[PDB]
Structures are given as C-alpha cells and as structure tokens.
Design a protein around this motif. Structure first.
Motif, PDB file in Angstrom:
ATOM      1  N   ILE A  31      43.378  58.142  64.463  1.00 27.37           N
ATOM      2  CA  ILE A  31      43.994  57.516  63.300  1.00 27.37           C
ATOM      3  C   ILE A  31      45.431  57.110  63.543  1.00 27.37           C
ATOM      4  CG2 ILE A  31      42.496  58.758  61.785  1.00 27.37           C
ATOM      5  CD1 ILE A  31      44.732  60.689  61.317  1.00 27.37           C
ATOM      6  N   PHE A  32      45.971  57.433  64.704  1.00 34.77           N
ATOM      7  CA  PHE A  32      47.345  57.115  65.013  1.00 34.77           C
ATOM      8  C   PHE A  32      47.551  55.605  65.094  1.00 34.77           C
ATOM      9  CE2 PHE A  32      47.709  61.496  67.105  1.00 34.77           C
ATOM     10  CZ  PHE A  32      48.026  62.046  65.893  1.00 34.77           C
ATOM     11  N   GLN A  56      52.900  48.656  63.169  1.00 39.21           N
ATOM     12  CA  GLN A  56      53.198  48.689  61.750  1.00 39.21           C
ATOM     13  C   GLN A  56      54.538  48.006  61.568  1.00 39.21           C
ATOM     14  OE1 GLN A  56      52.897  52.435  59.697  1.00 39.21           O
ATOM     15  NE2 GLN A  56      53.901  51.645  57.854  1.00 39.21           N
ATOM     16  N   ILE A  90      63.668  54.918  63.322  1.00 39.03           N
ATOM     17  CA  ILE A  90      62.230  55.057  63.466  1.00 39.03           C
ATOM     18  C   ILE A  90      61.569  53.812  64.024  1.00 39.03           C
ATOM     19  CG2 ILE A  90      62.228  56.667  61.600  1.00 39.03           C
ATOM     20  CD1 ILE A  90      61.099  54.546  59.825  1.00 39.03           C
ATOM     21  N   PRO A 107      55.466  54.271  66.886  1.00 42.48           N
ATOM     22  CA  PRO A 107      54.091  54.712  66.697  1.00 42.48           C
ATOM     23  C   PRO A 107      54.039  56.148  66.223  1.00 42.48           C
ATOM     24  CG  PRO A 107      54.641  54.737  68.977  1.00 42.48           C
ATOM     25  CD  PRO A 107      55.766  54.059  68.302  1.00 42.48           C
ATOM     26  N   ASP A 108      52.872  56.516  65.714  1.00 40.43           N
ATOM     27  CA  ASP A 108      52.660  57.874  65.256  1.00 40.43           C
ATOM     28  C   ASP A 108      52.704  58.884  66.389  1.00 40.43           C
ATOM     29  OD1 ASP A 108      52.428  56.710  62.820  1.00 40.43           O
ATOM     30  OD2 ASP A 108      50.248  56.821  62.724  1.00 40.43           O
ATOM     31  N   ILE A 109      52.758  58.429  67.637  1.00 40.68           N
ATOM     32  CA  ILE A 109      52.876  59.305  68.792  1.00 40.68           C
ATOM     33  C   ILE A 109      53.917  58.745  69.744  1.00 40.68           C
ATOM     34  CG2 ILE A 109      51.714  60.340  70.712  1.00 40.68           C
ATOM     35  CD1 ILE A 109      50.844  61.522  68.206  1.00 40.68           C
ATOM     36  N   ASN A 134      49.037  67.496  67.654  1.00 39.82           N
ATOM     37  CA  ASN A 134      48.821  66.060  67.559  1.00 39.82           C
ATOM     38  C   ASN A 134      47.813  65.673  68.627  1.00 39.82           C
ATOM     39  OD1 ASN A 134      52.249  65.860  66.832  1.00 39.82           O
ATOM     40  ND2 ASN A 134      50.633  65.241  65.417  1.00 39.82           N
ATOM     41  N   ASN A 173      53.949  54.078  53.885  1.00 39.86           N
ATOM     42  CA  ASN A 173      53.835  54.898  55.073  1.00 39.86           C
ATOM     43  C   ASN A 173      52.636  55.806  54.912  1.00 39.86           C
ATOM     44  OD1 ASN A 173      54.536  55.880  57.627  1.00 39.86           O
ATOM     45  ND2 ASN A 173      55.579  57.635  56.712  1.00 39.86           N
ATOM     46  N   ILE A 174      51.992  56.102  56.024  1.00 39.41           N
ATOM     47  CA  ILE A 174      50.845  56.983  56.043  1.00 39.41           C
ATOM     48  C   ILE A 174      51.222  58.204  56.851  1.00 39.41           C
ATOM     49  CG2 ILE A 174      48.512  57.259  56.746  1.00 39.41           C
ATOM     50  CD1 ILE A 174      48.147  54.259  56.254  1.00 39.41           C
ATOM     51  N   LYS A 227      49.982  61.073  58.627  1.00 42.38           N
ATOM     52  CA  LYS A 227      48.684  61.370  59.187  1.00 42.38           C
ATOM     53  C   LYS A 227      48.856  62.452  60.228  1.00 42.38           C
ATOM     54  CE  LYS A 227      48.241  57.123  60.427  1.00 42.38           C
ATOM     55  NZ  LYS A 227      47.597  55.895  60.927  1.00 42.38           N
ATOM     56  N   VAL A 260      54.643  68.111  64.067  1.00 40.41           N
ATOM     57  CA  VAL A 260      55.484  67.055  63.530  1.00 40.41           C
ATOM     58  C   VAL A 260      55.383  65.831  64.425  1.00 40.41           C
ATOM     59  CG1 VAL A 260      57.800  66.423  62.925  1.00 40.41           C
ATOM     60  CG2 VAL A 260      57.018  68.704  62.471  1.00 40.41           C
ATOM     61  N   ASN A 261      55.096  64.690  63.823  1.00 38.69           N
ATOM     62  CA  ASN A 261      55.001  63.424  64.525  1.00 38.69           C
ATOM     63  C   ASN A 261      55.922  62.417  63.849  1.00 38.69           C
ATOM     64  OD1 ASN A 261      53.726  62.029  62.365  1.00 38.69           O
ATOM     65  ND2 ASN A 261      51.765  62.903  62.979  1.00 38.69           N
ATOM     66  N   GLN A 262      55.840  61.163  64.284  1.00 36.34           N
ATOM     67  CA  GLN A 262      56.725  60.161  63.710  1.00 36.34           C
ATOM     68  C   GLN A 262      56.443  59.937  62.239  1.00 36.34           C
ATOM     69  OE1 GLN A 262      59.103  60.319  66.227  1.00 36.34           O
ATOM     70  NE2 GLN A 262      59.483  58.433  65.080  1.00 36.34           N
ATOM     71  N   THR A 263      55.175  59.958  61.837  1.00 42.17           N
ATOM     72  CA  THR A 263      54.847  59.700  60.442  1.00 42.17           C
ATOM     73  C   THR A 263      55.635  60.615  59.524  1.00 42.17           C
ATOM     74  OG1 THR A 263      52.956  61.166  60.674  1.00 42.17           O
ATOM     75  CG2 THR A 263      52.632  58.845  60.978  1.00 42.17           C
ATOM     76  N   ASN A 272      59.000  59.471  60.029  1.00 41.18           N
ATOM     77  CA  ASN A 272      59.136  58.234  59.275  1.00 41.18           C
ATOM     78  C   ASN A 272      59.468  58.551  57.827  1.00 41.18           C
ATOM     79  OD1 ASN A 272      56.351  57.128  61.185  1.00 41.18           O
ATOM     80  ND2 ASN A 272      58.472  56.532  61.486  1.00 41.18           N
TER      81      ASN A 272
END
Lengths: 318, 265, 318, 53
Positions: A15-16, A21, A80, A281-283, B106, C25-26, C28, C67-70, C73
């Motif tokens: 889902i990342f 975005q 970010i 990105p989410d990662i 993650n 923002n999501i 996730k 903890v990730n960027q989301t 973010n």
C-alpha cells in the motif's frame, strides 16, 4: 474457505505510495508598496525599479515581515517533499495612486507639493531587446521598491530598446510565467526559497563566469548529485530555454524646470507562485534525488552577483 | 542487474548460446539486448521439521506444499547488491545480512507467491538504446558488468560512468588517434532487486527453515549487429560500452534503484 | 487608458486562501506480525488478541520503529493545518501462515513441534453483541499482538455472542470505516496522533466516569475552546452515533489432551487511514478553531483507561 | 494458489533450441581484376580464362 464478509484471496498488495503523490501549494505574496522616484538616495531615485522575478523574490524574502503561511506551508512541505515543481508564476501589479512632487520655482523659493497626476500611467519595461543583469547583494537588496541600477532608464533618446506597457492608476497588470520547464519526470530539488541568489526555473544558457549557475542553465543538464558518501547520482535531463528579461518599473522621463518630474506610485503587487510538492514516499528512498536537480543559483564567494536576465530567444524556421 | 544471465557464476553452465555469443561478439561491432526473460519454476517445497523434546531435537524434512515461494522485488527501497566475484552472484548463495522480505514495522516489499508447481516469469526490455546506438560487444565474462538501462545512481567508489544517464557522453579511443564521441539519449530503468525468500514463520526457538527446488530459466534475447563486410573501426562511434562498476574495489555495490516517480504534464 | 498587454481594470482581488484548501494524506501502516497463542505470558496466551482500532493504533504508535513518512507527513501537515478530517479507515489483515504447537504426550515425555494447520482459519471476532471495554496502559500496551483481556474468548459454550469471521491462511480480511462523521463544516483539531488514549472519530455516547471523553462523544457536541486568554470559542455541532465494537483475533478453542490447542499465526496487517488536512489559511486566523473540535480522548489521571467500545446501535422505525 | 503477477501453472518447458536456428551469411568477394591475353607466360596467354566456380 473462510466464510466471513469482505474476505477475498489476497493479491499482490503493497500500500506504500511508490513515491507518486502531489499537493499543489501556492506561494502567494501580496504587498501594498511605495514606489518612490522623488528621493535622491536608496533606490528612491528616478532610476527605474526592477522586479527581480528571475530570483526568489516571489517569496517576499527581502523582508521577513511578509512571511505568511504559504511560505510556512512550503517550508513544511519541503521537509516531506523529495522534489518540487513550479507549474506557474503569476505576477499582478495593481496600481492605486499616481502622485508627483510639484515644484513652483520662484527665484530660489522652490515651493513643493505632491499632487495626483492621474492621466499619466505606470510604465512596465521589459528590457526585452537588451542583455541586462540584475545585481543582488542581499535579500533586502532585491526589494522591488529600492532596487535600481545606475544609468538605467526606460527612455533612451537615441535607441529606445524597451517595450514599456502603461498601467494607469486603477488598472492592473498581470503577467504569468510557466516554470514547469522540466520534463522526463525530473523535478527541482526542494528549496525553502530562503536564498536570493537562487533563481527560478527555466534555462538562460548564459551564466556569469564569476558566479557559475552550473548545468541547471542548459537545454541539456548534466550533474552528479552526491546523495551520500557513496551512491552519487547522475542527473541528466533536457530543458527548454527561457529568456526572462527584467521588468523595469518607471515613471516617464518628463522634463520639468531644472530636472525631470519625480512621481511616486502606490501599488498592490500580487505574486502567486504555483508549486507542486511531490511528497516523499511512504518508505525512505534517498535515491529519488536522481531525478531531482537543484534550482539554479549563483555560486562563488562574490557578495554582489549578477543574474543574467537574457532578453529573448531567436526562433528559427524549419 | 548483473550478467548472471550468462550463468557466469559457474563455468559448468556454459552452453552453446554463450559459445554462440562469444563467437558472434568477435564478428559484431555492436550488440543489442531486446528482451530478458526470467522464469522461475518451483518444483518442491521442503522444510526441516523439528520435534523438540528437552534437548533431543528430532530433525526431518517434510513437504510444506500449501506454502509458497516469495518473490520480493524490493521496489520501495534502495538496496545495493554486493559483488565480490562471479561465484558470489550465484542466486542460491547470494545473501545480504539483516535483510528480509518481512519487516514487522514497515513491510516495504512487494512479494509474489510462487507455489510448488506454479511458475514465475518476468520479462525485461533491455533495448533502451536509441538513435541507432548499440552496446559495445561484450562476452559477458565480467560480473561487475551490468545490464542495459539507466539507473542514474552509481557508487562514488565504483563509478559506472555516463552509461548510467538519460543522456550519455563519453569518448571512445578506438585508436591512438581517432577517438570518437559517443552521445545518446537513454531512458531510465529502475531494476529493483529480486529477493527470493521463505516466510518468516516462527517455530519453537527459531523461525522455520524451508528449502526449495526450482528450475530457473533465463532467456536473454540479444541481437548482434555483425561487422561490415569491410573493416570500419569507426562504427564504434555509435557503440557505447555496457555499464560496469569501475575502481579497484573487490566488493562492489550495484545500485538497484527501486523505481521512477512519474510526473503528469 | 494604458495600452499594455494583459492589462485590465482591477476587480476586487484578495488572493489569500480564505482558509479553504485540502490535501488528503493517507496514514498507512503495514506490518508483518506474529500472533502467538502458544505462550503463557505477555499476551501470548490463548486469550484473543484485540485490534484497538477505536484508538490511534492506526499510526503504529505502539512501536516507534514503525514510524514512516506518512506519519512524518501528518506530523508536518498538522503543523500547518487548522483542522483535520478522517474520511476513511481501511483495515486489512492478510494471513500467511497458520502454525500450531503439536504435542505427542507419552507419560510425562511431551514431545513438542510446530506444524501447519492450514485447513483451520483465523477468527475475527467483532464482539458486536456485548459491551466490552479495552484497557490501555501505555502505547506499547495496544500492540494488537500482545493485547489481551483475561477471561475473554470468542467461544462461550453457553451463550456465544460474537460474530466471528474466518480468515484462512492465504485469504485476506479487509474492513473499512467512515470516520467523516463530523458535519456542519466542523473539523477535528489537528493531532499528531501521538497519544493512545486519543480515540478515533465517531460518537459512542458511552464514556467512563473515571476518564470522561467529554462532549466529543455525543450526537450533539457542546464545548468551549479557549484559543486564547480572552477569545474562547463555542464549538457546537451535531454528530452521528458510531458503535465500533472491538475486533478480537483468536484461534479456535479446540481441546487437546490436557489443554486447548495453541496455534500461532503470521499476518500482514495493513492499515490505511485517509485523513484530509485543511491547511491553515494564507493569513493567521486563530479563530478557525471555532469550527474545529478535539479528538475524543480518555481524560483523568488514570494510568489504565477503558475505551467504551459500544457494540451496536438499535435502529427504530418511523 | 500464488497471487503474484505473471504466475501460471507450468507447462512442459525446455527452452533449448532443439537444434533449429538459422542465420544466413553471404560470403561476398569483389575484385577488380586484370584479365591479360597479351603475355606469353603465367596464364597471360591468349588461352581463355576459366572461372573455377
């Protein structure tokens, strides 16, 4: 076989974000400015005023008092965002008043007063026939109200080389740039726009030799981003030219007894800079910077640095 | 990302197709890789079962069919592959410490499941070159060589050189005199690292340890443009070398950039 | 009359945002988790696992390693946002393995091994017929893997009150919530989601007496936001009920020699929380908070606090 | 049942060539030749020239 609700055989699911975005922020700075040709010092001289749009003046960096949320939005998003994209720039100059210092000259008496000249306009010079650089000493130096260049004017009694639009008192003057020049999925390295020797997108192939901008002014960019002690990345893209001649605000050159007439203007100058942050990105992927390249910035140790401001491109038939 | 497509890790896997290429790369001024087809056919899924009684620890290997083979792409991460030697890139013994397809915090990997009797086929297009450019013919005998496609990333200790760029610039010597200027445009390519793994399943005292039996088929379609009927050493002006990790470094890290971020217009 | 290009008579122009801008923002969080019923300690017991979605577990707050960027973010946007809106919550539990600890009992010998039970599923209990609160001592306490409640099970040989879905090995279980309950242009006071006694949107009219959530659990909200030493604001909105019964993960109750069977599962639990930050206006307006109201949070000095988790609403014909 | 992309139940697969592959090469030799009947020696004689194809 599970009997529950909303149950299904899994497919490939990650889902990342995959780094794609986008959130368009508009850095908009709106100022009611005194434009004063009546003074003999500190840019108040009759010398035309330059709007240093080629620079990051779009942020209002010349005065920290004009910082608003849009900047504090960008400052936050540039944390970010792995890269940013400037997809428009909208400059709008709304004149309100046109005032001039009238002189009744009797012997040495010299009565002074300021009256409304409405019926004379504000002159927006483009300097589109000339190659004229803008000096930048400091952030305060690029204030469009105090920014001047000696022996410069919109009126040359020999060769008048400037296109000069007239903005009356209550009219408005809106010009729009497209800063989206980058292609091939490249982006601009996110900047908080806190340095004035930074310059806007677009390629003026000209750069000073004392202050090289670097490859970021080319139609064809080549650079190596370090991104780490190890992994240095090779950024290569194609880029369209951009001219970006300098706007020169001025009053007419009108000659009065003993000198020219000295006007002063009151304008509300609106700057909307549409800039789309592509969020990280989410990662963590430090290597996204391979497709990001820095904003053009005048380099060197030079205190006063000259932005090229190339007037125009000569088109060629095929 | 490397030349493992040749089976260079073991000289025992050399077949005619290599001995065809080795021959054609003598008569070819440039070569073009127009596909790469990787196919992993699983056959068996076996695991070492442990019956733990005190310290006794009975061992046996049983069939876990009903659990699959996980193909990780590492498409969300930037993860380089170490290459010490040709034998070091054998996909069976090639590992990286503290790496797994399963991160309880993650989980960043897309991981496909290949059951016992299923097969997994992935295809690459290595034809990236354009403008009538070709790859300098290589016998594919060096592992620090890398496949076509531009990962704009390169290590600083082992520069690949311009051959990873969207825009290539290099000077080929071709002679003591006539050195040639190779300049082309090239598309990006990501090429994230495939990571084969078993599940992370936890058993008493440790994770479960599986073992798999696969038939891994690699078809690399490569079109040799044969030398002209008359010697022209200067054809190399439109040929440019394969990207290869340079330097004196013994162990060298191929970038393996996960992905490109697309941008609307 | 000015003759320039793009000149026009000005209209009313204020380019500032008027406070209306939105960036979805999501948040996730994706985790491959060990779900272990084989242990006698630390939530590894056969006791069912609770997914504390009523809480802010959606952030992965139980472990700072997730903890990730989301999150980073959101943490950034919640600086520039005057209010936030949660318009979805997507929970997806992907089972991979089903393993159980097998026992061959000979006298006292007791051979142990772990084998694959595929053909038995994972049970998702809703506890939708009961009123069952979740204890929260700490952020780590809400980890869905170690979170248990004594004398709780999905299987009651007398009255089995739980709806329990079965998730096989390779199936997946996706459930979606709509957290958008707020209406009348109200928003949730931006939170970085760093406190677990915080609770998700939706009104469970129930609250503990030792830990009042406050008006934010009502169909009709009334509160006074201070916003300053002076200007305190009156937040009043209408809100729909929400039940939010507790998810209870469990294995079957199967009885083996001397005890029940003890399974252990391997799942990838994906949580997507869609949350739309309404960014601060381009000009400071501290009073936007009049239409923002805080997230429901268990108050008090209590260390261990019980989220209500009301099972259901009884509908009434008209 | 694996959920991946490009996954399928294997069929009989042996990718080896089965000996059938063909590449047409053209052996082409091009020569500007002196054909000389004026000499008394070494085939330059009036005797006809044979093309030993």
């Amino acid at each position: 076989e599970g009997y529950g609700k909303h149950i299904t055989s899994m497919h490939v699911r990650n889902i990342f974000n995959q780094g794609n975005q986008v959130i368009r922020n508009i850095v908009k700075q709106q100022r009611y400015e005194l434009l004063d040709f009546t003074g003999t010092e500190a840019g108040t001289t009759n010398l035309p005023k330059i709007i240093p749009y080629q620079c990051i003046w779009w942020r209002g960096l010349q005065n920290a008092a004009n910082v608003n949320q849009t900047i504090n939005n960008m400052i936050a998003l540039n944390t970010i965002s792995y890269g940013v994209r400037f997809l428009k720039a909208k400059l709008c100059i709304e004149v309100y008043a046109v005032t001039r210092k009238r002189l009744i000259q009797t012997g040495a008496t010299s009565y002074y007063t300021d009256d409304f000249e409405q019926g004379q306009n504000l002159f927006i010079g483009w300097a589109d026939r000339k190659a004229e650089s803008i000096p930048i000493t400091t952030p305060a130096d690029l204030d469009e109200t105090k920014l001047t260049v000696a022996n410069t004017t919109l009126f040359d009694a020999n060769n008048d080389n400037i296109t000069k639009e007239e903005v009356p008192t209550r009219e408005k003057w809106c010009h729009t740039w497209d800063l989206d020049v980058l292609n091939h999925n490249y982006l601009w390295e996110p900047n908080n726009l806190d340095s004035q020797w930074t310059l806007i997108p677009g390629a003026q192939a000209v750069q000073p030799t004392a202050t090289p901008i670097g490859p970021t002014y080319q139609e064809i960019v080549i650079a190596t981003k370090a991104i780490g002690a190890n992994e240095s990345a090779l950024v290569t893209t194609i880029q369209d030219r951009r001219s970006y001649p300098r706007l020169m605000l001025s009053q007419p050159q009108i000659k009065d007894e003993t000198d020219t007439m000295k006007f002063k203007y009151q304008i509300r100058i609106s700057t909307e800079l549409e800039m789309e942050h592509h969020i990280k990105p989410d990662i963590a992927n430090p290597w996204l910077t391979r497709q990001t390249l820095p904003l053009p910035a005048l380099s060197g140790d030079g205190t006063t640095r000259y932005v090229p401001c190339v007037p125009y491109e000569t088109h060629v038939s095929q």
